[PDB]
């Protein structure tokens, strides 16, 4: 399953941009992983 994970990661992006760049980069990498699969 990639659809709910994409949704959720999308929402903690749009909820907390104030996270340090580390979390943003890691989470974007996670979304790139899910759409790659």
């Amino acid at each position: 399953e990639f659809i709910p994970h994409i949704f959720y990661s999308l929402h903690q992006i749009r909820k907390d941009p104030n996270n340090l760049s580390n979390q943003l980069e890691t989470l974007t990498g996670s979304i790139r992983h899910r759409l790659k699969l």
Partner: peptide, 27 residues
């Protein structure tokens, strides 16, 4: 060879395509 032509004919293929493009722009 006609398989990919049939796949490109249905809209949701284009949908996944520009969804990938939009995430590429976002990243």
């Amino acid at each position: 060879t006609n398989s990919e032509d049939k796949l490109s004919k249905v809209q949701l293929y284009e949908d996944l395509c520009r969804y990938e493009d939009t995430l590429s722009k976002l990243v």
